[PDB]
Amino acid sequence: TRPTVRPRNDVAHKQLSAFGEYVAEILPKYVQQVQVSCFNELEVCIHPDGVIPVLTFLRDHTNAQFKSLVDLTAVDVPTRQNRFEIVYNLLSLRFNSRIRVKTYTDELTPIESAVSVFKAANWYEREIWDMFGVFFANHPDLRRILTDYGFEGHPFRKDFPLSGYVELRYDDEVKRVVAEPVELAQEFRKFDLNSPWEAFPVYRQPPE
Amino acid sequence: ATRLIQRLRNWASGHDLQGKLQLRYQEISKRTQPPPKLPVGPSHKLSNNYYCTRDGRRESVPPSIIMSSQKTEKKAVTPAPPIKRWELSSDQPYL
Amino acid sequence: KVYDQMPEPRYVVSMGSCANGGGYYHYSYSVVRGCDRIVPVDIYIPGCPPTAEALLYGILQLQRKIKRERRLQIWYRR
Amino acid sequence: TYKYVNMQDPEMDMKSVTDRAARTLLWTELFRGLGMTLSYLFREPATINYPFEKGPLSPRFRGEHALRRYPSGEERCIACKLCEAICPAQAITIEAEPRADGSRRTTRYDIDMTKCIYCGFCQEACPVDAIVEGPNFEFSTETHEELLYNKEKLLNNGDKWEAEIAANIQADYLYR
Amino acid sequence: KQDMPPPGGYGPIDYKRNLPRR
Amino acid sequence: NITLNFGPQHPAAHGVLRLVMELSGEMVRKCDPHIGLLHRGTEKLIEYKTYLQALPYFDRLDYVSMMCNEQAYSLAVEKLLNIRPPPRAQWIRVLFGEITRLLNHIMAVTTHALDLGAMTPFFWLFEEREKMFEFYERVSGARMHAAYIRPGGVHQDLPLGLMDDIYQFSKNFSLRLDELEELLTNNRIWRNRTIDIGVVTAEEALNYGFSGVMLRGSGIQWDLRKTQPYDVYDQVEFDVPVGSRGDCYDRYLCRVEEMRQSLRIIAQCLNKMPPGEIKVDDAKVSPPKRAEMKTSMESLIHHFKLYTEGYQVPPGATYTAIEAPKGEFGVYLVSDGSSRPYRCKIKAPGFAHLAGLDKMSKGHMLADVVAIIGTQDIVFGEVDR
Amino acid sequence: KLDITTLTGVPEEHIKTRKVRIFVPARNNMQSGVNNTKKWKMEFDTRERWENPLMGWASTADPLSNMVLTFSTKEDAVSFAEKNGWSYDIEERKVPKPKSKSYGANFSWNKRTRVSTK
Amino acid sequence: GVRVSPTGEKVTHTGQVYDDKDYRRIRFVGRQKEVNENFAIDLIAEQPVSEVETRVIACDGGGGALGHPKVYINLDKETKTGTCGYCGLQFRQHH
Amino acid sequence: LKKTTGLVGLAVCNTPHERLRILYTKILDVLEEIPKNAAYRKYTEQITNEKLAMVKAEPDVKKLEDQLQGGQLEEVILQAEHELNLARKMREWKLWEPLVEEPPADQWKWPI
Amino acid sequence: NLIEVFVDGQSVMVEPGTTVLQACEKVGMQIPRFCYHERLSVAGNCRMCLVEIEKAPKVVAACAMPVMKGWNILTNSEKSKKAREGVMEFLLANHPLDCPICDQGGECDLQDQSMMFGNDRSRFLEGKRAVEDKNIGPLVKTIMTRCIQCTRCIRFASEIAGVDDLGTTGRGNDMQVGTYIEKMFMSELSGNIIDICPVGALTSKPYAFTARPWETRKTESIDVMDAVG
Amino acid sequence: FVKPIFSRDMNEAKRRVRELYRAWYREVPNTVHQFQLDITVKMGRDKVREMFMKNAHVTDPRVVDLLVIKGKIELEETIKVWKQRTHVMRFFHETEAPRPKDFLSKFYVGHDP
Ligand code: SF4
Ligand code: SF4
Ligand code: SF4
Ligand code: SF4
Ligand code: SF4
Ligand code: FES
């Protein structure tokens, strides 16, 4: 229960918890869950219409100066209609604390841009615009990062093939590089390594 | 490697170079070495080895919930104690 | 374009498993698979990355490859 | 725990001052620093004389693949097809089929060095210690096709190097 | 014969720089 | 004004940037850093692979330091599996984490010197980086992109031969840094090229999330070791450089100090490695010795499984920062509990720096800009991905 | 009908040519585990894949062919195929019907279950 | 002495040589098709059959952890040899 | 007084105590027009008050950064200023209505 | 109507009669198993079903003991786990070391449940038994060695196939389910036994060595070889 | 129902597209000369008319306005003399074989759907 096991830090869990109810007090209007795992990792909801007003508050001291948007990590789950799950990782430097505060959005919901508030999201912007289509409040430019020029796709939508539909090559008489239909050789020979028989009864969503 | 050249070289050096050989000569280490045998491993005892204790992944639990989406001497509190003042280098106070 | 830019007799040496044909990443929308799709590579050097000495040897191969080339002799009998 | 860089304040003392202005003029230290590069002229140069000399390599070193045999001369491969399940780039392709003798045997083992990343997983993964990431490294080709190896070429590679490969394994096997 | 390589001794090293005025 | 695309092609561009400038006479106005010329898109490529398969990807992002990347993965995977490694593995991860740090800072130093046209240190010190690649080769069979650090810990035990020569290796190295001490550190031209260039106020740094020496140069003291000694750093002695002016000269001297600092640490890690497994006891995560798998059944069974479907993380999506020499490093896992990740974003420390460069660009002449890329230790591989 | 047919980057050809398949994946016959019957998933119909003239490799036609997608419910998947504009075919869940069983039911002279030696 | 195809090129150890109609055969022209001289098949039965008067046996392929996993070959039937599932080499119980 | 703040963006502002009392009286001045009911208001009260008295606890700049247990509070005047703009922001958020709109249960239903 | 019995915590309106197996499998909890089969017949051999009832002095057979009111069943409880460990330590105490050459070895139920349960390390020190092969048909190769005295196959064979050539033979050590005499088993549903084998004991000859399960895609439809559809 | 991107009802959106067409329609010769396209300029304008036709089935104003957002974003890359001649030619696909919509030919080609 020790040589392999990583010890559970109850203390920080206690402090983060208590601060968690503290914040739960402070912004009832958007804050929801106050998740607190044994990893010492706190988490909190925000409604997307509540993106900016919460985040600004975060930067300003209460007992945690949530300075430096370290990340706007993003996840797409097709099942939920609110398929997008934008996440604000954060770190109050003065208090050496860390927190994860996320949201959700639909394909045509103009979620608020923290560009005015953090500016670090001038690109967390355009990536998460481009890879997805998560339209953003008001940004100086929504021009694509990463993906090419005429490129139409939105990879990381967890949709359409990992190769994509596009596969460019130089061509002769046109004297120029041209995009072409894929035609993969050998093909990504995907292995379904999923295991029937649950190893974790403690979890397990009920059949209901 | 002639000694006068060594003198003039270390002369320009401001440092002995012979005192820290730069080119790796004879000493190195032997390539052909006697077998490792390796550590036996802590949990290869036969008397007991039930998975119930050694297991770590088994202790995993989903995070404690508070407030949640469903279901005044408060004293304002820190999430964690605020960052401490560091020492100033001490033994080499300045560069 | 850069390949077009250099004057004859230009040569190219592929290097690394990635440039060899998309390498580790061969399946992605990212990489452009074989570098030979763009420029007519002349010798391939396997490796991820190749040991630098393997690279050096590949260049010695390029020199031997030039050495066996004989444009003038063909022209005389052209 | 932190340390300031620089920060230190230079002396106003007249000896030290005129010395610094003497650096500002007569450059002094440049030459001192300059002198240092001279020290290199007198050191022996570090080039290995390739290819008549070659760089040191540990027995572990990973390189060209080769299938290899039993001491009896049967091929070690049993087509367990887990090395196909591991090759992170999935270079490997295997069609296991029965032998007329009935033994499991690959009919078309093959791998392309174009997608191989030489992590050398398969050297570790194989239960029968069939395939081996051999010593050889120098084998650049004129054409892409010469890279897409059949089981055949790999067997040949296991033929030329088997003395060597088995020798290195003889050096290494305890660690695994 | 159990073994592996734990340290055999290891003498002093100086991370500190020296820049002689000479 | 005159619109102008720059790299990749410039040696200064490192084969990656295309930061177009709409130059005036030579003073910059517009100066946008385009990227996605290297974007390997590994985020989806991580998703369709067993967690043991993900491991190479991190050697593939930080080209130079390598072991630190994999350690950045082993920490983040062992968290969800709640697994705590045998100590020897951690002394190793620190040892080669620091030797990777030597390789990384030697890289940044000598290349930054090359853009300043110094030429020589390059050749004075790669003579050493081959001396270290001989070591990763001695422990991995590969000169670089060694996979020797693993989520269970480590592939394999250290060969007996190293323990001496490595000491020998650092028996003389301090002098080799002395030879630089007699160059740029004191040299006149060098100060002018870098003094008072790209100075950054503490707040812009805290806004953009600058980290590492890039904070420590401008005086912010934020650090990812002593604040969170996630491994043996808590036992290790060392001391952290902090800059004053925010001069590139400052950041420079810091990196030289960290190199000294690893000269301090690696001494102690050589001084303190326990005997023990370098792997976890569990065969449900850490695979059996070839000697045991080929007799005992269960060892061969789980052997067969980890090499075919692998260990299963309990379900969860998490994030972990890393003390990369270049800064905070991003490990954003999203795991359904299947060995395949559901998602995995990777914040490069250099991403924020490049986001911040244009703030430092405008109002500076082009040589200032060439100075700036080398100011920030940016290997572009990690940044677009 | 909130079509995102243009909002997506997909070629019109792949949305015209084919219907996708919504379903709940079957349990292994060769294995005991019921565990994958749970959670819906949708998969595109397979196409022809000519052999590579060289090395005998697969040479896939349609790029999208390896796609797979889990769903909490059936209406969920239907909603996705509707949002995305592809045609689909719903399929029912297949929980096995309960079977009464008892240790003694094997026996009894009258029931003609009996079995035999044990 | 690999069996020769009608085209004259040697067949692979897994026999599969191309048809005379086959255009693909053109690839080998100007070059050399390569096939291994040492078929493992002949070498399987080339070896003498080991025999032990006992009963159940344990082959390891020669070399502890240098070969196939330890395996227990039965010899219940003297009417047949006990070929290894790995080594492919026969065994029998002489008496 | 110590020469050089050390930090780059920060700059010295002599007689910090007075300037801080300015900030206390002013953020108090804005919290007062914020309704008592808003959950933030009582705690920002606790903060401004306990910190103001805490500044009053000691005179010199020197031990003042010990009394608040924070190195160089010369920065926290700036943080207090963020706190001031924050408290200015509290007004347009109004008194805090508990929650608005809720997730479909599928949201946050982790795993999947 | 239905009797009440508690899964670990939740009360359950379980059917009158019926095994603890179906009880836990109503809430969705799933007991480890081998010899039992869902549409076959209960057999007490190979007790992987072991669990302790909340008031149980000692563990019960969950696949067999009929439910009754007032019981509570902590499947996750430690003693049950010690029991399953007791099973798996033994099944593997003499199993052949041939996962890799097993056609079932890429997907054997014994493997998955070897992962779910049983100590990672083994403590064998002697010499395992190994039976000779025992052909029973051209189209159903039988490696044996591998069969775990689980008797699901005879209960299939003797019954639904209607043929009884298959069956137990002997007692004590070196007991075997190898059918008596050389004569081949034959049936018009001879092949289905292959599916029903937990291990690689009953690998089909025609498909042998051909492939590995994970690689395969599983395209679905219906056969028209029978009008049965 | 749900809050709109920019335009609400088609005319707020329809106004934006025309702004887009001219934004291309004037820009075209500039592109014809910057990249020295061998296409006759009327072909360029025709393609300009065509890409505005592929989006004919659009009916949600959020879809229209999001399409002109992305289309103007493409215009950004165009006007700034980003891209390359090849990228401009990607709209043409001239290297690709023509597709016979006729079913009989579809029979003649291959297995297909
Ligand atoms: S190693 Fe060299 S080749 Fe292999 S991926 Fe990294 S760069 Fe491309
Ligand atoms: S190595 Fe030989 S045995 Fe192991 S997988 Fe590759 S082919 Fe099958
Ligand atoms: S070499 Fe590395 S990559 Fe190529 S197959 Fe063996 S393991 Fe997979
Ligand atoms: S049966 Fe299952 S376990 Fe026994 S060998 Fe074949 S696979 Fe491995
Ligand atoms: S076949 Fe062998 S293993 Fe499968 S059930 Fe019948 S006996 Fe047990
Ligand atoms: S499950 Fe059938 S007896 Fe254990």
Coordinates of C-alpha atoms and ligand atoms in Angstrom, one line a residue, chain F residues 297 300-301 304, chain J residues 92 95-111 146 198-201 212, ligand 4:
Chain F
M297 CA 3.4 -18.3 -16.6
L300 CA 4.5 -14.2 -19.6
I301 CA 0.8 -13.6 -19.6
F304 CA 1.8 -10.6 -23.5
Chain J
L92 CA -2.0 -21.1 -13.8
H95 CA -1.0 -24.1 -17.5
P96 CA 1.2 -24.4 -20.6
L97 CA 3.5 -21.5 -21.4
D98 CA 2.0 -21.0 -24.8
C99 CA 0.0 -17.9 -25.1
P100 CA 1.8 -16.8 -28.3
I101 CA 1.2 -20.0 -30.3
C102 CA -2.4 -20.2 -29.1
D103 CA -5.0 -19.3 -31.6
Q104 CA -7.2 -18.3 -28.6
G105 CA -4.1 -16.9 -27.0
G106 CA -4.7 -13.4 -28.5
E107 CA -8.1 -13.3 -26.8
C108 CA -8.5 -16.0 -24.2
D109 CA -10.9 -15.3 -21.4
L110 CA -8.4 -16.8 -19.1
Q111 CA -6.1 -14.0 -20.0
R146 CA -4.8 -26.0 -22.4
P198 CA -12.7 -20.7 -23.0
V199 CA -9.1 -21.4 -24.0
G200 CA -7.2 -22.6 -27.1
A201 CA -8.0 -26.2 -26.4
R212 CA -5.0 -12.6 -34.6
Ligands
SF4_4 S1 -5.2 -20.4 -23.8 FE1 -5.5 -18.3 -23.3 S2 -3.9 -18.5 -21.9 FE2 -3.7 -20.5 -22.4 S3 -2.2 -20.1 -23.9 FE3 -3.8 -19.9 -25.3 S4 -4.0 -17.9 -24.8 FE4 -2.4 -18.0 -23.4

